[PDB]
Amino acid sequence: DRPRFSFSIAAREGKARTGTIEMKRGVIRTPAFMPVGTAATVKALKPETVRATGADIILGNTYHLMLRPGAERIAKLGGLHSFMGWDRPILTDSGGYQVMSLSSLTKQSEEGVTFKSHMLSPERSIEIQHLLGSDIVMAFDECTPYPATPSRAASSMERSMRWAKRSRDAFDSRKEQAENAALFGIQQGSVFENLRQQSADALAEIGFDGYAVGGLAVGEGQDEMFRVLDFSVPMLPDDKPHYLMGVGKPDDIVGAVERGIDMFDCVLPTRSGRNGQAFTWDGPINIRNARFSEDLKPLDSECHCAVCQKWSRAYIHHLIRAGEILGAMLMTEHNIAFYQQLMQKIRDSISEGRFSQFAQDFRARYFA
Amino acid sequence: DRPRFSFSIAAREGKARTGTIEMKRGVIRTPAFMPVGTAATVKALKPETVRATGADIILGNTYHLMLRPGAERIAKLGGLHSFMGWDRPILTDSGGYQVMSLSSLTKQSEEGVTFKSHMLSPERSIEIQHLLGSDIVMAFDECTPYPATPSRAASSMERSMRWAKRSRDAFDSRKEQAENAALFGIQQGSVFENLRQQSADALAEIGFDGYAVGGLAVGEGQDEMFRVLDFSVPMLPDDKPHYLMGVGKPDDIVGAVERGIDMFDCVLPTRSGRNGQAFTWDGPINIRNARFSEDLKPLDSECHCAVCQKWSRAYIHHLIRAGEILGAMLMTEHNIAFYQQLMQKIRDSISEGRFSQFAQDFRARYFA
Ligand SMILES: O=c1[nH]cnc2cc3nc(NCc4cccs4)[nH]c3cc12
Ligand SMILES: O=c1[nH]cnc2cc3nc(NCc4cccs4)[nH]c3cc12
Ligand SMILES: [Zn+2]
Ligand SMILES: [Zn+2]
């Protein structure tokens, strides 16, 4: 039987790593991309389809779920896995990020955040994630807005570290959760090296199963994000997974792996898929464009997904233009599959010591 | 290799029949329910899922398709079957019914109907259905509104019979179509027995592969519809399929089979599914109802569909309330599967000479 949590690194190249996270509900191949489940569903996909794309784990947003059906109700119904029909690992977010993003009349304090649906404390967040039956639980933090002054970034980071300790204690106080789930801490500090160091030190002292880099992908742009990752990731414990929250575009993922990131999530493949954007190895295309109206080729010429085996650009163009549900289904399946194929190529190239070459080849073609 | 068209009756009970239609693209078990494909998709379902429910044939609406992408474009892309990924038979409607329903500034004449997208003649309709690559082609007719005076019903029916002859000639003039597809005529005459007789006589004189009962399910109600079917269906050639257009609710289907109907279509399982209505053997339920919020039972206790094997009422309730695409997917798959299971029970009971008993048992439970 698999352990609660075991991260093993099988191969390395520079700062990049490939390996596995073993958990009770399954094995996660790293670097990993986690499709996002909002409101207990990866939009427009049955869980079996999500698995068919290659996903080992999904991210469950807790924000909508804690509102409806409610964490308690989901617990009564047997937990999130049973509820939505996904039996593999689920990483849940804390709910606090989207509270700041989607709620109104929010009021912050040292205790937590109070909000009106469109009080969430570290303790309540951990409890909600428990009630959902989360496999990987995120500490409740505060994502510092960008740009931030050094003073405000420091104050925000310091609060987040206090909340990280509270998250740790709440998690540990619940026997069933502590024995069956894992807990990740989140590094803050904006773009400031000294604050990032203090945050990493605080998190490592508390001790977590994995470490996220927070406070990025919030408007700073790729150059600045990469610059911050350059010094921030080496501050985290090497022997634990590194999770870059909310990232991202294919090129962002490749660059982040080059800098030591092991885990990713974003709504981009799902959300932009329903909007008409399809990822290809020659860069993204918008299937709504009239140039695809009679194009019999698949979305991507090399993609192994079921959509590219069966349907043409012309048909998917028609579906998206017509507002048909099947359009969203096909675009989303392809995009998630593309992301998983990207992760597989990344893992294989690191394992073979040719990831640097892959990154170069990928960029040359993707941006040709 | 299968013939262009062969209808064989394997068993009978009263006016009810069960058998098969053999065509080049596949065999159709009768009595048959045809899921409706609007804009080249059965809403929220991949074709493989439509087939998995038990469907042998789908109905392709031509109205939206002749507007976008256009019949000519679909022909250039290889035809409707290739376009949407359904390789089994497709019955196409003439496009005229929805022109009267969905278009504005329509102008009728003996030549056909002129309309503004939100001239369609018998010849153009048959050509469009050819360009789509239809297996069963519907004659272009006029659905007389209800109620209709005897004079207006007569004039409308007479025009429809003239259009039926024009449809026949257009179909026969095109070698590829005449050799590979079938053509159905449509009986009109409103609720009037003498006009129904004249219409049946006219259609039989022209000669068709199958005969539809038109002009019903247009507001008359079940009692009146059944009364008209009582005298109308026996007027049609016994050795050819009988198709009741636009029907319908499960009880309507059962009663229509009792009166000699072999083929059905309606948007009810697809459309009402997305709205929240789920069919069960104990009658329809609306999954949005709060009473289902914590109900762990499947949509129906006996249903063999994949949805009822995997997901609870509680989950589907949540999805539909949240406006999630997966909600529409699951509801539609179940409803279409329910309809196919109904047709299977009908076919089996006729084959076993116990259909009368089945109809009684069905109604007693469905309306309990
Ligand atoms: O520090 C963080 N803490 C907890 N959750 C996060 C989620 C995050 N998502 C993004 N970027 C993606 C976006 C989602 C919505 C606006 S930007 N950056 C993120 C940072 C954090
Ligand atoms: O005589 C007909 N001719 C050609 N198409 C039809 C389609 C039909 N669909 C219904 N009823 C279902 C409805 C669809 C829209 C409003 S009622 N009745 C129908 C009658 C006809
Ligand atoms: Zn693909
Ligand atoms: Zn079912």
**Which residue has the least CA distance to atom 12 on ligand 2?**
B246
Choose among A145, A118, A69, A128: nearest CA to A93: A128
Paired with B286 in beta bridges are B277
A74/A83 Cα distance (integer angstroms): 7
Structure tokens at B125: 């309709």
d(CA A155, CA A195): 10
- Residues A31 and A10 sit within 8 Å (Cβ to Cβ): no
Nearest-angstrom CA–CA distance, A32 and A58: 10
Q: What are phi and psi of A249, to 5 degrees?
A: -60, 150
Asked whether the beta carbons of A363 and A251 are under 8 A apart, the reply is: yes
CATH architecture of the domain with range B1-368: Alpha-Beta Barrel (3.20)
| Residue B151 and residue B200 in contact, taking contact as beta carbons nearer than 8 Å | no
- Integer angstrom CA distances of residue B127 from B82, B133, B235: 18, 10, 29
Give the C-alpha separation, B361 to B368, whole Å: 11
Joined together, the tokens standing for residue A92 give: 């849940």
How many angstroms separate the Cα of A339 from the Cα of each of A29, A308, A336, B147, B170? 14, 14, 5, 58, 51
- Given a contact cutoff of 8 angstroms between Cβ atoms, the answer to whether B38 and B95 are in contact is no
| CB-based contact A92:A98 (threshold 8 Å) | no
Distance of CA A339 to the CA centre of its chain: 12
Q: In Å, how far from its chain's centre is CA A44?
A: 18
- CB neighbour class for A1 (10 Å; exposed up to 12, middle 13-18, buried from 19): exposed
- Positive or negative, the CA dihedral B102, B107, B108, B113 is negative
Question: Largest Cα–Cα distance of chain B, in whole Å?
Answer: 60
| φ/ψ (deg, to 5) at A37 | -100, 115
Smallest-distance ligand from the CA of A338 = 3
* Structure-token match 């194009």, residue found: A295
Please give the angle made by the CA atoms of B88, B94 and B99, to the nearest 5 degrees.
Answer: 130
How wide is the angle at C-alpha A156 spanned by C-alphas A150 and A161, nearest 5°? Answer: 120
Interstrand relation of A277-278 and A26-30 (parallel, antiparallel or unpaired)? unpaired
* Torsion B326-B331-B334-B335 (CA) sign: negative
Chain B residue numbers touching A40 (CB-CB < 8 A) = 315, 318-319
Q: How far from the centroid of its chain's Cα atoms is residue B228's Cα? A: 19
The DSSP string of A203-225 is HHHH--SEEEE-S-SSSS-HHHH
Rounded to 5°, angle at Cα A140 from A86 and A97: 75
| B200 and B236 Cβ atoms separated by less than 8 Å | yes
Contact A338, A303 (CB under 8 A): yes
Q: Name the residue with tokens 């012309």.
A: A314
The sheet that has A26-30: what strands, in order across it?
A: A6-13, A16-23, A26-30
* DSSP three-state, residue A46: coil
B91: nearest Cα among B222, B244, B198, B228: B244
The C-alpha atoms of residue B134 and residue A55 are separated, in whole angstroms, by 39
Quote the Cα angle for A352-A357-A359, to 5°.
Answer: 105
> Å from B9 to nearest chain A CA?
36
The token pair that represents A93 in the structure block: 């977010």
**Which residue minimizes the CA distance to atom 14 of ligand 2?**
B246
The 10 Å Cβ neighbour count of residue B119 is: 10
From chain B, pick out residues whose CB is under 8 angstroms from the CB of A74. Answer: none
Name the phi and psi angles at A75, rounded to 5: -60, -45
Q: Which of A83, A324, A328 sits opposite B315 (nearest CB)?
A: A83
Q: Is A162 left (phi over 0), alpha (psi -120 to 50) or beta?
A: alpha
What residues in A contact B322, CB-CB < 8 Å?
A: 39, 64, 68
**Cβ distance A152 to A112 under 8 Å?**
no
- For A211, phi then psi, to 5°, come to -130, 125
Domain ranges of chain B: 1-368
Q: Which residues of B touch A (CB under 8 A)?
A: 39-41, 43-46, 64, 68-69, 73, 76-78, 83-85, 293-294, 296, 310-312, 314-315, 318-319, 321-322, 324-326, 328-329
Closest-CA residue, ligand 2 atom 11, reads B246
Q: Give residues with Cβ within 8 angstroms of B186, minimum separation 6.
A: B138, B139, B141, B160, B164, B203, B211, B212, B213, B214, B245
User: Which residue in B9, B55, B14, B136 sits closest to B344, CA to CA?
Assistant: B55
Compare all CA atoms of chain B with the CA of A70 and give the residue at the minimum distance: B318
Residues A249, A226: Cα–Cα separation, whole Å: 13
CA atoms within 13 A on the CB side of B80: 31
**Mutational test site, ligand 1, from A245, A252, A264, A268, max ligand atoms within 8 Å of CB:** A245
Radius of gyration from C-alpha coordinates of chain B: 20
What number of other Cβ atoms are within 10 A of residue B306's Cβ?
Answer: 17
Q: Quick count: other Cβ atoms within 10 Å of Cβ B287?
A: 27
Please give the biggest Cα pair distance in chain A: 60
Report the sign of the C-alpha dihedral through residues A9, A13, A15, A18, in that order.
negative
Q: How far apart are CA B20 and CA B31, in angstroms?
A: 8
SS3 state of residue A142: coil
Ligand 4 ion: residues within 5 Å (CB): B 303, 305, 307-308, 334
Q: Which amino acid belongs to residue A363?
A: R
CA distance to A198, A235, A272, B282, per residue, from A362 (Å): 35, 28, 21, 57
User: Using CA atoms, how far apart are residues B37 and B140, in angstroms rounded to an integer?
Assistant: 19
The two tokens of residue B44 are 């929220």
Cα distance from N-terminal residue to C-terminal residue, chain A = 47
- Nearest-Cα distance to chain B for A17, in Å, is 35
The Cα B86–Cα B51 span in angstroms is 9
C-alpha–C-alpha distance, residues B192 and B268, integer Å: 27
Backbone φ and ψ for A228, nearest 5 degrees, come out as: -70, -40
* DSSP calls for B260-279: T--EEE-SHHHHHHHHTEE-
DSSP structural state of residue A290 = G
Q: Is the dihedral of CA B305, B308, B313, B314 positive or negative?
A: negative
What separation in angstroms does the CA of B294 have from each of A76, A251, B298, B317, B340? Answer: 8, 43, 12, 9, 28
Q: At what angle do helices A313-321 and A325-351 cross, to 10 degrees?
A: 130
Rg, Å, chain A Cα set: 20
- Please list the residues that pair with A260 across neighbouring strands: none
Show the tokens assigned to A66: 């804690």
C-alpha neighbours within 13 Å on the C-beta side of residue A236: 27
Report how this structure was experimentally obtained. Answer: X-ray
Pocket test for ligand 2, best of B98, B141, B218 (most atoms within 8 A of CB): B218
Question: Strand, coil or helix: what is B221?
Answer: coil
- Quote the tokens at residue A171: 């998690």
Can you list the alpha helix ranges (DSSP code H) found in B133-241? 150-172, 175-180, 193-206, 222-232
φ, ψ dihedrals at A52, nearest 5°: -60, -30
Question: H or E stretch including A59?
Answer: strand A58-60
Q: How far is CA A115 from CA A118, A124, A158, B40, B205, in A?
A: 9, 14, 22, 45, 74
Distance of CA A268 to the CA centre of its chain: 11
What is the phi/psi pair of residue A16, to 5°?
Answer: -80, 145
Breaks (C-N over 2.5 A) in chain B follow: 118
- Any residues with CB less than 8 A from the CB of A317 and at least 6 apart, and which? A287, A288, A289, A292, A293, A295
CA nearest to B265, candidates B13, B36, B22, B11? B36
CA B147 vs CA A62, B151, B192, B224: distances in Å? 55, 12, 11, 11
Tokens of A6: 């075991």
A31 in Cβ contact with A351 (< 8 Å)? no
